[PDB]
Amino acid sequence: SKRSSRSVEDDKEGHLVCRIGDWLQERYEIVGNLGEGTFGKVVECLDHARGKSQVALKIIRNVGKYREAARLEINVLKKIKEKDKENKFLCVLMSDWFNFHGHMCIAFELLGKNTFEFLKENNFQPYPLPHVRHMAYQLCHALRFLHENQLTHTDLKPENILFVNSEFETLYNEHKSCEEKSVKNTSIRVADFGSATFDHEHHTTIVATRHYRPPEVILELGWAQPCDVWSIGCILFEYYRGFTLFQTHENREHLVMMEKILGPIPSHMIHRTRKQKYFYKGGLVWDENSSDGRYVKENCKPLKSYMLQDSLEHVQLFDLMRRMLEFDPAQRITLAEALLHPFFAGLTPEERSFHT
Ligand SMILES: O=C1N=Cc2ccc3c(-c4ccccc4)c[nH]c3c21
């Protein structure tokens, strides 16, 4: 079963050429393909060393900078693994890693669809509030654990949050004369630790996928754990309405959106930033008549107006979201404090105790 170097081949980009039935490490038998990315690909395997159980095996390209990145990812994942020996903090648990002819491979439990793919397959119809609450709780919990360990994820978004199981029932919406998929179990895991960064390491100027990037980062004021909290705020809005809070492609535009949605940037952050071009008279400067300006003006309104209903549940979700999307990161709610928010009184007990 041990593959000699003649049964191993890479495409031009350096991807391992894979086929169903191929073996790795005399242990993992490929039984399917789960997706591809810049880094490489993820395949489903049966782990024959463990009663044929299913795994997701992530295979990094055989390219210098990808392999080295992967080595940092493995360190993060090992620390998580060691600090959550009880399996209770909901970050993907690495079961094995190895170097396959220069491809770094990481083995995990096999999960379901990511929360973005589920949303897309539901035609961007949003998750119902109770699902939003359970998922938000799990996110606060998972990342409070990360933050306690001097780590920041830096790249949280819906595609990096995976359902344990994404089997659904199909329902019907009266109000919109269409079908709706509703996930049966809203248990989630936090994935993709490829950018996670220790407190002691070098902090690059820019982190996060744009739509999920906080103002401190755009303004280049430095960042830390508060970065993730902002991303979570953006994620919750997206789960609740089904569309991106900040559908943006440029910094000035992004800042205007923040202003229109959330109120004025604090002066103190404007005085502190070296990105003074975005400003004028201590005030954010932009062309309201440009394409981007007219887009922002048509489409970006006060945050509270996006509420779908007006009962307590919904009021509390918006209060938490507003606190998570506070401009000033030294004043933004922490996850420890987020877990005490009244929004979370509203959980079922199995949900809260993690009997889900
Ligand atoms: O089932 C899984 N358990 C862990 C895990 C991690 C990543 C993935 C991905 C994937 C695939 C392509 C790009 C990006 C991600 C699909 N399933 C995954 C799993």
Author numbering: 129 to 484
Question: What does the primary publication say about this deposited structure?
Answer:
The CLK protein kinase family is closely related both in structure and function to the family of dual-specificity tyrosine phosphorylation-regulated kinases (DYRKs). The ATP binding pockets of CLK1 and DYRK1A are rather similar both in terms of sequence and surface shape. 3-Aryl-substituted 6,7-dihydropyrrolo[3,4-g]indol-8(1H)-ones were identified as inhibitors of the CLK protein kinase family.
While the 3-substituted derivative 8a was identified as a slightly selective inhibitor of CLK1, some 2,3-disubstituted congeners and a 6-oxo derivative were less active or not as selective versus casein kinase 1 (CK1) and against DYRKs. As observed in the 8g/CLK1 complex, the lactam element of 8a establishes hydrogen bonds to the gk+1 and the gk+3 amino acids of CLK3, and the indole nitrogen forms a water-mediated hydrogen-bond to the hinge region. The cavity near the αC-helix and the DFG motif is not occupied by the ligand, but by an ethylene glycol molecule which is kept in place by hydrogen bonds to the canonical Lys186 and Asp320 of the DFG motif. In further inhibitor design approaches this region of the binding pocket could be addressed by tailored side chains sprouting from the core element of new ligands.
